[PDB]
């Protein structure tokens, strides 16, 4: 159809985030590309205001699930692409176990031929010497299942999952995600059956990037419907 045809090949991506965590303000810009035929995302971000005040891994989920690979038998369950090119609003609250929380609102939509994710993030109530503001998180990422259900009343979807952030002392800090996606346009979207996205990420550094930065690779495939 229309929305899914926008994703048949490689699509450039722009990411812009303004954040405020415990009054510490910052901005991030990122760019790369997505290829939903492979379910693959590649991005590089820089903090344009200096040092990022939180660990980079805690922003991974905030920094475009329209690039998931949906198998052909599940095509009618791909809300994200069906809302394009007009886009969708992605809102989250992220609860870090025994620590603060992020509240994010993003617009994901096409601006020309580029898919753009513009985000506002506010974090509150973090312990200034917790795992987060104390940068005790390892610079890595694990695999998670992203659970999706329709929210017919709001003409969108509800999404939730729990991220495992490995800590430098060998423990794990859980980040509990609650997400709702709502279409920006008034065109019709696909309201899916219950399913999930199998996601995997890897983080690295660009040895020639002098600014505080993250390189992110994500693989995302939809499953859970025979």
């Amino acid at each position: 159809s229309k929305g899914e045809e926008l994703f048949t090949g490689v699509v450039p991506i722009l990411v812009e985030l303004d954040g405020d965590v415990n009054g510490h303000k910052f901005s991030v810009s990122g760019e790369g590309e997505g290829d939903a035929t492979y379910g693959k995302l590649t991005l590089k971000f820089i903090c344009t205001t200096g040092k990022l005040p939180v660990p980079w891994p805690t922003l991974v989920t905030t920094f475009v699930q329209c690039f998931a690979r949906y198998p052909d038998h599940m095509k009618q369950h791909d809300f994200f692409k069906s809302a394009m090119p007009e886009g969708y609003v992605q809102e989250r609250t992220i609860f870090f176990k025994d620590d603060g929380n992020y509240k994010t609102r993003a617009e994901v939509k096409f601006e020309g031929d580029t898919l753009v994710n513009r985000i506002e993030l506010k974090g509150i109530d973090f312990k200034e010497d917790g795992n987060i503001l104390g940068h005790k998180l390892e610079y890595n990422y694990n695999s998670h299942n992203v659970y999706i259900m329709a929210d017919k009343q709001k003409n969108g979807i509800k999404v939730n999952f729990k991220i495992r952030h490995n800590i430098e002392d060998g423990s794990v800090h859980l980040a509990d995600h609650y997400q709702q996606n709502t279409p920006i346009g008034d065109g019709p979207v696909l309201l899916p059956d219950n399913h999930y996205l199998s996601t995997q990420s890897a983080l690295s550094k660009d040895p020639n990037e002098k600014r505080d930065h993250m390189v992110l690779l994500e693989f995302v495939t939809a499953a859970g419907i025979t």
Epitope: P12, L14, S29, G30, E31, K44, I46, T48, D206, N208, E209, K210, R211
Partner: nanobody, 119 residues
Amino acid sequence: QVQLVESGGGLVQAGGSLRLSCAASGPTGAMAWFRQAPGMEREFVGGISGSETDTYYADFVKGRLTVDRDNVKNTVDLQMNSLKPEDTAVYYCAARRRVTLFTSRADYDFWGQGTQVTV
């Protein structure tokens, strides 16, 4: 394709000042200056995002330099103060199609041919 035309530079001695300028054939995104000392690796000096809202200078360029940009003329300019003999190098204008001011040379799409600066 997009071509970058460098001018300025040349010979100075310590303490002096020098100016470099770069003119782009067309409009572009982030613009930056790099330099490459004789057998060293190309390092980022300073630049301006395509939107001009982000300016970044390397650590060694302290407050000694100023980059400005002109999206109508499609030019980025660099001015150098308090020159030291370690500033001797071949300076390169660089630009990207896209807007973000990354600093790795691999992120840049268009290059000038290199302008000698000798302090």
